[PDB]
Specification:
The structure is a homodimer of 305-residue chains.
Chain A lengths: L10 H4 L2 E6 L2 E8 L2 E5 L6 H5 L3 H6 L6 E5 L2 E3 L1 E7 L2 E6 L9 E3 L7 E8 L2 E9 L18 E6 L2 E12 L2 E5 L25 H13 L13 H10 L7 H6 L1 H7 L3 H14 L18 H10 L4
Parallel strand pairs in A: 8-12
Antiparallel strand pairs in A: 1-2, 1-4, 2-3, 3-7, 4-5, 6-7, 9-10, 9-11, 11-12, 12-13
Helix pairs in contact in A: 4-7, 4-8, 4-9, 5-8
Chain lengths: 305, 305
């Protein structure tokens, strides 16, 4: 019993973090086999943080301009190239701690773990969601660039995020092929995050977790239709609900015996009348950063190795 | 910028988790050098979950009654003994992944990371606090017994908690010398958790984190004394505040320029008037599971290796 914001165990990723220095800039890189991946803006200098030409900046570098260190060992850079917004540094030694991995691009509403790092050294792990506006509400200080986000699926690490920049309180980055999430660029412009919305299917999954854990006070006997619900949801800046979402919630409906559309009726009331000073799973707000799979994993107990 | 419930990287601990089976009972153990530590109730059977005599149960066992597996490798048990509520299983192979470690007993209000495990396999990591009533509000399903709680101090893992039982929604366990936190026993009796209170010094540390991150709406120009504050705090089930707590908050007072007693005045108002539908660091409740050190670590950026 109980319900926590739970991150994936980070051991497999900790062994891939290295420090990358170019000039006076130091940040983090990801070392898989004989390639180190890091944000390309490690080659930028003040004058260039405004309007950089990365192809120009890269052609003026050579392999020995890149100091890469895995702890105390130094890695020899034997080749470099750029793929979109990441730099791929070829090194002379393959990481012997390379896990089984793949590179995946996630969708808004999906969650992952972030291993926050400074100077190549792991500092903390936490769980977050990709927001509908393609930012994450992370926790990052200067020097955290190159920290990665990941999920663990069986024995396999799915890398889905590399941190690049902070934009007025929230955080933006790329997948591991170097393509940004959202309409952001790795330079100084007037870019801001767009309007965020609440991830409705995640709120419903969390209300199911609450029932599983004994919080039942918000239930009622009413029911509703997808279209009546989506009418009220749009008013409160909630993502609309599809039939696909209903099916995804199937397992949780089965385990609690409460139909999805029954639960939607409870959500509709919570949105119109409020919490009334009561809490749900220790929160006074409706929580939207747990997916249906997160709830199943924590309320049924899947492991990895 | 940003503020998250951040756990320690778990890699160093993942390499010490093993599976321990005795009879039909399987749970988790901690393998450091050539000793496996696990809850002693792994030797109990139904008839004994009520009123067990553990010395009797242990004398009727031999080394080959204990199946210990580190992944796929099996470990040979060459000796066993009991220290308070833990079992120490001597095995024929020293764990080569044994980190630098020590065994510490924590105080209520202190936080640590939990590596939740099933069948010896790590499943998730999360941060929690030891409550003033000596329970933790964890997330554990059947089979999680033997999962450990820890902090990382420099290069050194401080083990502080081993999970033993669930008591009506909350969780109870021992230090690694086998002594329970709180007045609990590892048998079936009528034991319940006592009344919990809110950890005041932690709430103040969190309000400082909020200011550091730009949430200032709750501040005011008033001030107060320790005794006036503690008078109102007792009314709301808050732990009283000592001069020691004030000193601990020193660094955060220095960084924000807001005196502790100034901040206490803001807390006093929040307790008497409420949140008024506004949030602090994304919460509509006063959060008490971040220590002053947690805030410094996240808002200044200490790493480990």
């Amino acid at each position: 019993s109980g319900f926590r914001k739970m991150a994936f165990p980070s051991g497999k990723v900790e062994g891939c973090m290295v420090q990358v220095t170019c000039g006076t800039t130091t940040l983090n890189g990801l070392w898989l086999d004989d390639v180190v991946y890091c944000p390309r803006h490690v080659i930028c200098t003040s004058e260039y943080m405004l309007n950089p030409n990365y192809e120009d900046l890269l052609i003026r570098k050579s392999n020995h301009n890149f100091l890469v260190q895995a702890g105390n060992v130094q890695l020899r850079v034997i080749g470099h190239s750029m793929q979109n917004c990441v730099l791929k540094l070829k090194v002379d030694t393959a990481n012997p701690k390379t896990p089984k991995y793949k590179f995946v691009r996630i969708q808004p509403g999906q969650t992952f773990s972030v291993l926050a790092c400074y100077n190549g050294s792991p500092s903390g792990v936490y769980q977050c969601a990709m927001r509908p506006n393609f930012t994450i509400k992370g926790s990052f200080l200067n020097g955290s660039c190159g920290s990665v986000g990941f999920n663990i699926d069986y024995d396999c690490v799915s890398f889905c995020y590399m941190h690049h920049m902070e934009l007025t309180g929230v955080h933006a980055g790329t997948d591991l092929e170097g393509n940004f999430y959202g309409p952001f660029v790795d330079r100084q412009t007037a870019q801001a995050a767009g309007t965020d919305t609440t991830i409705t299917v995640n709120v419903l999954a969390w209300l199911y977790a609450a029932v599983i854990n004994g919080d039942r006070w918000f239930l009622n006997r009413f029911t509703t239709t997808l279209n009546d619900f989506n009418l009220v949801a749009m008013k409160y800046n909630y993502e609309p609900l599809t039939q696909d979402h209903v099916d995804i919630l199937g397992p949780l409906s089965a385990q609690t015996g409460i139909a999805v559309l029954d639960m939607c009726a409870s959500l509709k009331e919570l949105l119109q009348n409020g919490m009334n000073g009561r809490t749900i799973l220790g929160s006074a707000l409706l929580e939207d950063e747990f997916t249906p799979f997160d709830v199943v994993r924590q309320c049924s107990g899947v492991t990895f190795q």
